[PDB]
């Protein structure tokens, strides 16, 4: 195996350190014997050269076993090793492959060992084969090339394919070249025979830098089997997704379930793991069985019904533009679709989240749209157009009373049920001939007692108490208590900021089921105004529900 | 010979990592650094650095802006004790300020052999097909806040005869920009610019007309009403209670007198006018300056922007919270987006004229819209540091 031409990289050590010097432990003497044979074989082959005493550095080796292994253990080695450049941001996804005529897969054999180490840290990769039961010198040797297990391999390896496809790159802008760890994927638009021809070409350019490729017969054809993908030469998908069915599920069956259906959410629309995921709260054990509920059951019901018949994605087109749809699939889910001609994907996935306690539809769509879009920068390195189930008019009211700047990109509505909408909006000035509710909430902080109530202009008054309460829980139940009795139109009046923004940012959804039964109060209201006044600072009509909230507890 | 840039103790270099960015910004950035690599102002790196800064393309002509932010923090030190520009205090007081990108003056200039490598920065590609490109400077950068410092020498021998023969306009560098103002005629003024732009010409060195004597303050405005509601008097006694946290004598006894038991919100209740000694003395102190509120060279300015409605933002810049330093507003097919960059550049740039220093902004956006979308608007060759907040409901209407 050949020893690459290149320029090796100027490796250092981390400021203010020496390089290793851990004891090798005593081997039994099959383990010496085999540690022997391997390492003359490497030093034949150039990979590892023979040192003296006077290099003081060590690292421990040890052997495993029909073909015995080196196993050289780099843990004080790559402590003491500089940082180097993290190697990429992803990894690329299929979706974002051009489509090619033809594609071939070429890796690299002995990669590591094909690279040389810098000649300034060798000294450092030291290493011992001890003598039988340590009584004389054992057999020293040092790496010439790249070590497996030391912390610089990937980073040099990396850069040395880089800076050798170059050339290569230049003589040929119509050939695609996709650089993954030992692989090469090598794409072009040419009939296959120029195209195995220029692969050759390419081969050839390789064993000039000591780089070892497959021949014809050895080099991978498509379907190509990847990072849990099928690649197709006009299509791709995951690989075979199967469901166990099982009587009893533990929490390890529902982990491995959910990333297996997070994993086909990819490529298969409509995948749902809200209902199965919730499951899997609590702490219990790995072997605890987690008896399914009738909702966990009904989800897991319509996963297997959608990735019942198999499902594939396509290639992109960089001349044509990128169109994302998206869906409201349920409570805090949702589904979408990135395709450049009408219904025929090139991937797809979901969006569930929890962006805060009290949210909105409205809110919850923003977050998906930018999601997407970075993702779509990230595979595309461009936005797409989206299709979202909201008017535009309810966008326009939404962003222009809202107190966040908040924007989506080129959009363009579309007629599919569930629709985005606010299910209530609050008066913008006080109602004419409607009661207005004074109400505040106070809570003893060493009983956690507390109590929650309204005084209003019509005479009404009423104080409930509350037992393992706060001072924000009472203030949402004095507003609860007056939007339970007021009646269709109402104006209400609190000292509490707190409530005022939940309230103000039109939630439909909360953590909260106090928050819950407010919103299903405002919704059911005709017209409802809330205002809000300083505390404690002698304002007529909070000074009377003050006092009457105050006595027992502050 | 360069000059030796020594990194705070105990502290490295910048790991900051790279913005996916769009084909078009990736292609923009390749062409400039081919350009750059060829004339030996950037040059190729290994994987043995292991420090990155980010890098975007801002605009017909696309440039290259490299956020330094990070860099600067580590570097404070150097540039701000070592090395300092002294900021004129009369540059504000000029009632015409002309901002000059005066950046080009720094590739001539080379950067310490044992500081390069701090200057790392990655062009991405898309879909992660091939490894980023990674370049270092061999010269001053841009948006490095030692490039003006290191400079500060030779950027005193261009400019001498022009000071020496014009001692009424003062001249101020801040980063890439050089800050020119005089009290002349707006033609006299346009004419001294150019003037100075041919002794810049005369060194390799290549608009913005600010009016700084005419930036006055956003007093906490109060209502004139003819007639007052329960509502009114309650959202007028909630602004004043506010303000007097603030405004130092700030009176409300008066007008909370008229708000007497639980009386209906839109129950019109005519005023005593005894109070309207309040609302008068009130109007009088929110017209002048804050008292007892002065700017601390030490600590750090902070900014924060609030969205009105209809294109209108509010902002004020303080200290210690509620100990506002200024306070202002900014006015607009213009989206939230579009608008909000704009008034933090505008701001900024006010900033670095009062006090030759950015603000740190409280931003009311989501992290991810604002860094997805702000280098689609922003002009301004340096980047101020931001956080992302949740505006309160009441600081909105309080500064309205
Ligand atoms: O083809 C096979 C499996 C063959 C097989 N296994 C078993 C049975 C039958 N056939 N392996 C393979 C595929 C790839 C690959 C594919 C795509 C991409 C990259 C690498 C790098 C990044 C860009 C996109 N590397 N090695």
Not at chain 1, 196 to 211: A, D, F, P, V, Y
Not at chain 2, 67 to 89: C, M, S, Y
Not at chain 2, 153 to 180: A, C, G, H, W
Request: glycine residues 6%.
């Amino acid at each position: 195996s050949p020893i690459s031409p290149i320029e090796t990289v100027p490796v250092k050590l981390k400021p203010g350190m020496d390089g290793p010097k851990v004891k090798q432990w005593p081997l039994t003497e099959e383990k010496i014997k085999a540690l022997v044979e391997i390492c003359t074989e490497m030093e034949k082959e150039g990979k590892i050269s023979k040192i003296g005493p006077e290099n003081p550095y060590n690292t421990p080796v040890f052997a495993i076993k029909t073909k015995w292994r080196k196993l050289v253990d780099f843990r004080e080695l790559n402590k003491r090793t500089q940082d180097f450049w993290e190697v990429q941001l992803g990894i690329p996804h299929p979706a974002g492959l051009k489509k090619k005529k033809s594609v071939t897969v070429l890796d690299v054999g002995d990669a590591y060992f094909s690279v040389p180490l810098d000649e300034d840290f060798r000294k450092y990769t030291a290493f011992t084969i001890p003598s039988i039961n340590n009584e004389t010198p054992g057999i020293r040797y040092q790496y010439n090339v790249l070590p497996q297990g030391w912390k610089g391999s990937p980073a040099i390896f990396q850069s040395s394919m880089t800076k050798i496809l170059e050339p290569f790159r230049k003589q040929n802008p119509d050939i695609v070249i996709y650089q993954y760890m030992d692989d090469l994927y090598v794409g072009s638009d040419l009939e296959i025979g120029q195209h195995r021809t220029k692969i050759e070409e390419l081969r050839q350019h390789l064993l000039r830098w000591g780089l070892t490729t497959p021949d014809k017969k050895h080099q991978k054809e498509p379907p190509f089997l990847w990072m849990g993908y099928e690649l197709h030469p006009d299509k791709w998908t995951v690989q075979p997704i199967v469901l166990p069915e099982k009587d009893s599920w533990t929490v390890n069956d529902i982990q491995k379930l959910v990333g297996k259906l997070n994993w086909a959410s990819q490529i298969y629309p409509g995948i749902k793991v809200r209902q199965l995921c919730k499951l899997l709260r609590g702490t219990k054990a790995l072997t605890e069985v987690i008896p399914l509920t009738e909702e966990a059951e009904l989800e897991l019901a319509e996963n297997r019904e959608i990735l019942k018949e198999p499902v594939h994605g396509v290639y992109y087109d960089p001349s044509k533009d990128l169109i994302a749809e998206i869906q409201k699939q349920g409570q805090g889910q949702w589904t979408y679709q990135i395709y450049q001609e009408p219904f025929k994907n090139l991937k797809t996935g979901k969006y569930a989240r929890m962006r805060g306690a009290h949210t909105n539809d409205v809110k919850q769509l923003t977050e998906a749209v930018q999601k997407i879009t970075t993702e779509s920068i990230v595979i595309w390195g461009k936005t797409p157009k989206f299709k979202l189930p909201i008017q535009k008019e309810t966008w326009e009211t939404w962003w222009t009373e809202y107190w966040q700047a908040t924007w989506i990109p080129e959009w363009e509505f579309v007629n599919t049920p569930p629709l985005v909408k606010l299910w209530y909006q609050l008066e913008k000035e006080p109602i004419v001939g409607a009661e207005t509710f004074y109400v505040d909430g106070a809570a003893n902080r060493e009983t956690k007692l507390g109590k929650a109530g309204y005084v209003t202009n019509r005479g009404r008054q009423k104080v409930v108490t509350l037992t393992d309460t706060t001072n924000q829980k009472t203030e949402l139940q004095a507003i609860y208590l007056a939007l339970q009795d007021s009646g269709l139109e109402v104006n209400i009046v609190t000292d509490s900021q707190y409530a005022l923004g939940i309230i103000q940012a039109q939630p439909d959804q909360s953590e909260s089921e106090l928050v819950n039964q407010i919103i299903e109060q405002l919704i059911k209201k005709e017209k409802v105004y809330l205002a809000w006044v300083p505390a404690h600072k002698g304002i007529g009509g909070n000074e009377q529900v003050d006092k009457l909230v105050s006595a027992g507890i502050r | 010979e360069t000059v030796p840039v020594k990194l705070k103790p105990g502290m490295d270099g910048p790991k900051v990592k790279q913005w996916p960015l769009t084909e078009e910004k990736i292609k923009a950035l390749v062409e400039i650094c081919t350009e750059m690599e060829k004339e030996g102002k950037i040059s190729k790196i290994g994987p043995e650095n292991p420090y990155n800064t980010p890098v975007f393309a801002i605009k017909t002509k696309w440039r290259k802006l490299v956020d330094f932010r990070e860099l600067n923090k580590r570097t404070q030190d150097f540039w701000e004790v070592q090395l300092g520009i002294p900021h004129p205090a009369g540059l504000k007081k000029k009632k015409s300020v002309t901002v000059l990108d005066v950046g080009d003056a720094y590739f001539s200039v080379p950067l310490d052999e044992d500081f390069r490598k701090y200057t790392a920065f990655t062009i991405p590609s898309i879909n992660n097909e091939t490894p980023g490109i990674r370049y270092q400077y061999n010269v001053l950068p841009q948006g490095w806040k030692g490039s003006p410092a290191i400079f500060q020498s030779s950027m005193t021998k261009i400019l001498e005869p022009f000071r020496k023969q014009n001692p009424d306009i003062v001249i101020y560098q801040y980063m890439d920009d050089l800050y020119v103002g005089s009290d002349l005629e707006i033609g006299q003024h346009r004419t001294k610019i150019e003037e100075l732009r041919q002794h810049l010409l005369r060194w390799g060195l290549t608009g913005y007309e600010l009016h700084p004597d005419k930036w006055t303050v956003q007093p906490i405005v109060l209502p004139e009403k003819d007639s007052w509601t329960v509502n009114d008097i309650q959202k007028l006694v909630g602004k004043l209670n506010w303000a007097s946290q603030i405004y130092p004598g700030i009176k409300v006894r008066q007008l909370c007198k008229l708000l007497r038991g639980t009386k209906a919100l839109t129950e019109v209740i005519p005023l005593t006018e005894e109070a309207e000694l309040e609302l008068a003395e009130n109007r009088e102190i929110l017209k002048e300056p804050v008292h007892g509120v002065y700017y601390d060279p030490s600590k750090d300015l902070i900014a924060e922007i609030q969205k009105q409605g209809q294109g209108q933002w509010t902002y004020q810049i303080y200290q210690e919270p509620f100990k506002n330093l200024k306070t202002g507003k900014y006015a607009r097919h213009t989206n939230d987006v579009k608008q909000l960059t704009e008034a933090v550049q505008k701001i900024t740039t006010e900033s670095i004229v009062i006090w030759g220093k950015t603000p740190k902004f409280k931003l009311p956006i989501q992290k991810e819209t604002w860094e997805t979308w702000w280098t689609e608007y922003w002009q301004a060759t340096w980047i101020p540091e931001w956080e992302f907040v949740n505006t309160p409901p009441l600081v909105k209407l309080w500064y309205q």
